[PDB]
Amino acid sequence: MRVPININNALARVRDPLSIGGLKFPTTKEIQEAVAAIADKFNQENDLVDRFFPEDSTFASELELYLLRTQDAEQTGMTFVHQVGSTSLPVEARVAKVDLAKATWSPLAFKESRVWDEKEILYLGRLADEVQAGVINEQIAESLTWLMARMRNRRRWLTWQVMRTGRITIQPNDPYNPNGLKYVIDYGVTDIELPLPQKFDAKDGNGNSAVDPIQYFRDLIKAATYFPDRRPVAIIVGPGFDEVLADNTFVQKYVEYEKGWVVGQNTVQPPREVYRQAALDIFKRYTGLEVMVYDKTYRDQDGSVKYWIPVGELIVLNQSTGPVGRFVYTAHVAGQRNGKVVYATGPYLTVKDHLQDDPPYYAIIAGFHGLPQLSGYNTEDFSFHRFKWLKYANNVQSYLPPFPPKVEL
Amino acid sequence: DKIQLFRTIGRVQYWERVPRLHAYGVFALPFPMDPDVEWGNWFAGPHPKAFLVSVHPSGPKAGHVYPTDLSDPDSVANVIGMVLDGHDYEADHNVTVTLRAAVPIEYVQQGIEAPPLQPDPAVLNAAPQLKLKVIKGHYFFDYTR
């Protein structure tokens, strides 16, 4: 929604034509005009978790999973001891066993509407010039595009709610829940937070820190050599990760080793330029995992500009970097075709033109049905660990530049 | 709450049958079962189990088998054998009682409150007057004699 004005016609019109000043005659002057367009550059859309699962359709309303597990008996049990002139002895009884399990699924629902009454359909034009009542065809077509952006925003909110907590929680006192509904949807995410009581920039004592991240993320790979779904593969971090590594006094000795920087001889100790410029590659080579930086930002309701992945926090992936999950579109009643009801999945957009009745109007309804769904649990013990969250430092904000406040006319 | 996580439904355990000495020999006769005995909790469980049966020598239920009351000296004096790996008690009421075999001591429990695969100490204690002979951790019995 922009203001319906004419730009050039309004600059040439906010100029008093019949006004004189304290000098009681009209005076000479020179006038320059300029046009500015104020936007918020630092409120971007969380397009990270769009790739962490694609979208799918099912034309059903519930999905159920069945798992059948078998456990045979082992060929163990050494042999019984004999003497030559006697009889044999019988062998013990073994046991085999099978179990079977079940899980379900069912989606959510959301739709909304908007209506335009009879006055504003033909009683609005521009503000500088005059227009023969056709600005509503411009303003509906933006609001038609806006309703598609609502559902794309609603999909990402549920998606990030799983990615951050593994818990869809909807409360009545909530933005964009006027109907006052209740959902607490607990997915089966096991141990979403990695423990780290001294983070990386604790720096207890004089100047020496406490925890080596090259050793910490190598400790995790060592403790999951026989847990193949549990060793880390990549890490996605916010902006200020190199500035934690460069002030660490453990990682620094890795940087000095690969360049021969003994401080007492050979060199005076360098500044933090190259001492941080090589902090990524020495982290990537000695932990073996990938690092992706996601510094994309949004603006808070009240405060300053925040990051999507928060400041002193990162995510840790596991056995694959591929799609962790799936977003499912379920069925919805579309229009009939030949007396039979026809269905459809995905976001829909229905037009209800009542432009010929006694007060005419025009209405649009938009929504869909669906919910995210995780990929697949561990069959042995029913656990899910593909992503985990780590709070790695406390004072990353002091290593980050500030932001412009939101300009508001 | 719109998603149920995995929970198990079926629980099937398939054990093997009660082993016995090949060279000692078999002798088994089918007897009728006592209807007053709740035979459900005697054949309950997937575990390999044997148990002793007595017989009513007289009265209105004569010739019917019932599990041996070890606290009764009359039921100890009337033991006739063991039931090995119990049958369909619901479709039929005539059990095959083994009168002569050689069974390890880990597979014979009298009490329902007795763990499987463990020796029943009440059976070992009364094995002199139950005509049981414990040799090499095995019960030897023959009730034809």
Query: Roughly what angle, to the nearest 10 degrees, separates helices A213-222 and A279-287?
Result: 20
Distance CA A24, CA A19 (A): 10
Which residues on chain A are in Cβ contact (under 8 Å) with B85?
A: none
Cα(A366)–Cα(A150) distance, integer angstroms: 9
Instruction: Measure the CA–CA gap between B145 and A67, rounded to whole angstroms.
Output: 55
From chain A, the residues in CB contact with B116 under 8 A are none
Q: How far is B126 from chain A (nearest CA, A)?
A: 24
- The SS3 assignment for B74 reads helix
DSSP character at residue B29: E
CA B100-B101-B103 angle, 5° bins: 145
Q: Which residues contact B38 (CB under 8 A, 6 or more apart)?
A: none
Angle at A271 between CA A265 and CA A274, to 5 degrees: 95
Which amino acid is it at A70? T
**Cβ atoms B22, B29 nearer than 8 A:** no
Query: What is the 3 state secondary structure string of chain A?
Result: CCCCCCHHHHHCCCCCCCCCCCCCCCCCCCCCCCCCCCCCCCCCCCCCCCCCCCEEECCCCCCCEEEEEEECCCCCCCCCCCCCCCCCCCCCCCEEEEEEEEECCCCEEEEEEEEECHHHHHCCCCCCCCCCCCCHHHHHHHHHHHHHHHHHHHHHHHHHHHHHHCEEEECCCCCCCCCCCCEEEECCECCCECCCCCCCCCCCCCCCCCCCHHHHHHHHHHCCCCCCCCCCCEEEECCCCHHHHCCCCCHHHHHHHHHCCCCCCCCCCCCCCHHHHCHHHHHHHHHCCEEEECCCEEECCCCCEEECCCCCEEEEECCCCCCCCEEEECEEEEEECCCCEEEEECCEEEEEEECCCCCCEEEEEEEEEEEEECCCCCCCCCCECCEEEEECCCCCHHHCCCCCCCCCC
What are the two backbone dihedrals, phi and then psi, of residue B140, each rounded to the nearest 5 degrees? -110, 125
How far apart, in Å, are the Cα atoms of B140 and each of A81, A97, B107, B122? 20, 32, 13, 16
**3-state SS assignment for residue B122:** helix
Q: Which residue reads 């401080």 in tokens? A: A263
Residue pair A202/A209 in contact (Cβ under 8 Å)? The answer is yes
Residue A2 CA: distances (Å) to CA of A37, A123, A125, A152, A324: 11, 17, 13, 21, 39
Tell me the shortest Cα–Cα distance from B59 to chain A, in angstroms. Answer: 40
CB A372 within 8 A of CB A162: yes
Q: How far is B55 from chain A (nearest CA, A)?
A: 29
CB-based contact A88 B22, cutoff 8 Å:
yes
Beta-carbon contacts of residue A94 (< 8 Å; ≥ 6 apart) = A73, B15, B16
- Say yes or no for a CB contact (<8 Å) between A90 and B20: yes
Q: Supply the angle between the helices A213-222 and A251-259 in degrees, to the nearest 10.
A: 100
Short-list A322, A351, A319, CA closest to A335:
A351
Nearby residues of B123 by Cβ (< 8 Å), 6 or more positions away = B52, B70, B105, B108, B109, B110, B130, B132, B139
Distance of CA A27 to the CA centre of its chain: 60
Q: Is B125 helix (H, G, I), strand (E, B) or coil?
A: helix
Of A159, A227, A164, whose CA–CA distance to A192 is shortest?
A: A164
Q: Given an 8 Å threshold on Cβ–Cβ distance, is A108 in contact with B2?
A: yes
Size of interface A-B (CB pairs under 8 A): 83
Cβ contact A187–B23 (<8 Å): no
The whole-angstrom separation of Cα A137 and Cα A278 is 56
Q: Which positions in chain A touch B138 (Cβ < 8 Å)?
A: 89
Q: How far apart are CA B142 and CA A46, in angstroms?
A: 82
Amino acid residing at A284: K
Q: Which two tokens stand for residue A240?
A: 């200020």
User: 3-class DSSP state for residue B80?
Assistant: strand
Partner-chain contact A90 B17, CB within 8 Å: no
Only one residue has tokens 């995905």, namely: A346
- CA nearest to A148, candidates A353, A350, A394: A350
User: For residue A336, what are the contacts with CB-CB under 8 A and spacing of at least 6?
Assistant: A342
Between strands A387-391 and A313-317, the pairing is antiparallel
CA distance A161 to A167: 7
Say how many C-beta atoms besides its own lie within 10 A of residue A135's C-beta.
Answer: 16
In terms of Cα–Cα distance, which of A390, A404, A191, A189 is closest to A309?
A390
Residue pair A92/A315 in contact (Cβ under 8 Å)? The answer is no
- The pair of structure tokens assigned to B114 is 């007795």
Q: How was this structure determined?
A: cryo-EM
Angle at A175 between CA A174 and CA A181, to 5 degrees: 45
Burial code of B102-140, b = ≥16 C-beta within 10 A, e = fewer? bbbbbbbbbeeebeeeebbeebeebbeebebeeeeebbb
How many helical (H) and strand (E) elements, i.e. helices and strands, does chain B have? 2, 8
Of B1, B7, B18, the CB nearest to A184: B1
Chain B residues inside the 8 Å CB shell of A186: 1, 3
Cα angle for residues A155, A157, A160 (degrees, 5° grid)? 110
> What is the torsional sign of CA A220, A221, A227, A230?
positive
Q: Percent helix, strand and coil across chain B, each rounded to 5?
A: 10, 35, 55
Per the listing, tokens 């990938």 go with A290
Per CB-CB distance under 8 Å, the chain A contacts of B10 are: 98-100
Sign of CA dihedral A211, A213, A215, A221: positive
Search chain A and give the residue with CA nearest B47. A95
Subunit contact B6:A67, Cβ cutoff 8 A: yes
| Contact of B10 with B42, CB cutoff 8 Å | no
Burial class (CB in 10 A: 0-12, 13-18, 19+), A151: buried
Query: CA-based angle A161:A197:A319, to the nearest 5?
Result: 50
How many Å from the N-terminal Cα to the C-terminal Cα in chain B? Answer: 68
B79: enclosing H helix or E strand: strand B79-84
Q: CB of A290 within 8 A of CB of A233?
A: yes
CB contact under 8 A, A101 and B48: no
DSSP B23: G
DSSP B101: E
Bridge-partner residues for A343, per DSSP?
A333
Q: A320 CA to chain B: closest CA distance, Å?
A: 23
- Could you tell me the resolution of this structure in angstroms? 2.8
Categorise residue A9: left if φ over 0, alpha if ψ from -120 to 50, beta otherwise: alpha
Q: How far apart are CA B60 and CA A90, in angstroms?
A: 41
Residue partners of A392: CB distance under 8 A and separation at least 6: A196, A199, A200, A213, A241, A244, A312, A313, A314
| Stated length of chain B | 145
Question: If we measure between CA atoms, which residue out of A47, A144, A106 comes closest to residue A347?
Answer: A144
**A339: which 2 tokens?**
């007396």
CB contact under 8 A, A89 and B8: no
Residue B144 tokens, joined? 């034809």
CB contact under 8 A, B3 and A108: no
Which residue in chain A is spatially nearest to B136 when comparing CA positions? Answer: A89
Test A97 with B9 for CB contact under 8 angstroms: no
**Phi, psi values for residue A138, rounded to 5°:** -80, -40
Contact between residue B99 and residue B81 where contact means Cβ atoms under 8 Å apart:
yes
Residue with tokens 């149920």: B4
Q: Cα distance from B20 to chain A (closest Cα, Å)?
A: 6
> Is the Cβ pair A104, B3 closer than 8 Å?
yes
Q: How far apart are CA B107 and CA A93, in angstroms?
A: 10
